[PDB]
Design a protein around this ligand. Structure first.
Ligand SMILES: CC(C)(C)NC(=O)[C@@H]1C[C@@H]2CCCC[C@@H]2CN1C[C@@H](O)[C@H](Cc1ccccc1)NC(=O)[C@H](CC(N)=O)NC(=O)c1ccc2ccccc2n1
Lengths: 99, 99
């Protein structure tokens, strides 16, 4: 598909057995998902945005479907205002920015 | 060009006649540049990211070249951790996401 940028590039994702809407984000190194009760072990992390840092839980090898494309990788969970799909997963679904 | 996402999508911009590096950022509504002297009228604004909100100077109708493509639009100048080109200017240069 092709997604224009007139509006936020939101797509449906499936993670942890739940459907969510998430932003396809070339500016994000990492994938950050709003607080949800994912099972298993995690590692503490702090990540940096425009306004400072937030505390997140780092989960590895998380199964995650993005606009119908399967992916697996690291997902950070914590108190974000948007679910964001960053480059660690955008590469897995073969996304490019084109102009 | 077609830009893959294994690395940060950094390009050269020209703003105020000065060359800078900036991130092509589909997750950003707005374009935010580090503190600089910039010819133009500005008004105070607040914008949010992960981590919270910051104060910026909003400059409208600024000429900016992005990877050799012309845009003229709103640039926010302030203590951003990084120079980001958001959707307001990505749309001007005809950028899309593809997968
Ligand atoms: C997600 C994370 C891994 C932490 N990465 C980042 O946050 C990196 C950090 C980099 C260094 C600091 C400068 C910004 C760049 C790019 N960002 C990605 C970048 O795409 C980031 C992702 C994002 C989207 C929505 C909400 C929050 C955060 N967007 C932003 O920082 C832009 C800034 C702007 N235009 O005003 N924010 C928004 O466009 C935006 C939209 C909705 C919101 C609702 C509530 C609160 C804040 C909201 N911010």
């Amino acid at each position: 598909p092709q997604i224009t940028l007139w509006k936020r590039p939101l797509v449906t994702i499936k993670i942890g057995g739940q459907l969510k809407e998430a932003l396809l984000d070339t500016g994000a190194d990492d994938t950050v998902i709003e607080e949800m009760s994912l099972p298993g072990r995690w590692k503490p992390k702090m990540i940096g945005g425009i306004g400072g840092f937030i505390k997140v839980r780092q989960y590895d090898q998380i199964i995650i479907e993005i606009a119908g494309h399967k992916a697996i990788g690291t997902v950070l969970v914590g108190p974000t205002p948007a679910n964001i799909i960053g480059r660690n997963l955008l590469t897995q679904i073969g996304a490019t920015l084109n102009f």
